């Protein structure tokens, strides 16, 4: 009643975009350790019964194309949708291997009115990336 | 009708405007905690409560170490942005 229906035939897709190496133009150092994360995610969502699809070092163009095609799939038999983004970033922006791409442009493909098969279904986006250059020095307890 | 922006959940690794930390060998603080909390609670807690555990783990168990004072002894708190209309259970 107060919970999303999670008993469809399939739990849903889990798209993991793992960007480790960035073009020198971007000027971003390799994201060492991200492979460990991607593998950890794969195994974690596999146990949660998700159809995991991993992708590596995608350009901004490829990220958008991938998301576009995924939103166009028929999710009628899927309970939900999960997308994990591992890469460099800024506020409201995620980086492709060759450059940045607005997070909004990616999520719009899944809007309740642009992806009818997922309307009313939980769309989860896990973002591991910077959202600026502020440093939290914290406070002692 | 339902809003076109409804039923979305954005699980950010860090607060708006801040750096997100990653361990070159163990992986990013956020992803490590997330997978661990999901493995330990995905069969008993609702997702918002799981992510809260993730917030506490990242916030209390992690502190950066660097030869560069600028990135040394820093903290991080993940950011849960939810436009969901119902509770989410992975089992």
């Amino acid at each position: 009643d107060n919970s999303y229906k999670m008993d469809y035939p399939e739990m849903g897709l889990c798209i993991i975009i793992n960007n480790k190496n960035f073009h020198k133009s971007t000027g971003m150092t390799s994201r060492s350790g991200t492979d460990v994360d991607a593998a950890n995610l794969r195994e974690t969502f596999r146990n949660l019964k998700y159809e995991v699809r991993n992708k590596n070092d995608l350009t901004r163009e490829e990220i958008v194309e991938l998301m576009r095609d995924v939103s166009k799939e028929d999710h009628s038999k899927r309970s939900s949708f999960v997308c994990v983004l591992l890469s460099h970033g800024e506020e409201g922006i995620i980086f492709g291997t060759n450059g940045p791409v607005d997070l909004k442009k990616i999520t719009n493909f899944f809007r309740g009115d642009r992806c009818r098969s997922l309307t009313g279904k939980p769309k989860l986006f896990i973002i591991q990336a910077c959202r600026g250059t502020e440093l939290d020095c914290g406070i002692e307890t | 009708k339902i809003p076109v922006e409804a039923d979305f959940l954005y699980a950010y690794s860090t607060a708006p405007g801040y750096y997100s930390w990653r361990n070159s060998k163990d992986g990013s603080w956020f992803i490590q905690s997330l997978c661990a909390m999901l493995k330990q609670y995905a069969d008993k807690l609702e997702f918002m409560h799981i992510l809260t555990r993730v917030n506490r783990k990242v916030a209390t168990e992690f502190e950066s170490f660097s030869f560069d004072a600028t990135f040394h002894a820093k903290k991080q708190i993940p950011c849960i942005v939810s436009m969901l209309t119902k509770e989410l259970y992975f089992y």
Partner: peptide, 4 residues
Amino acid sequence: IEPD
């Protein structure tokens, strides 16, 4: 530790 490295920043993202």
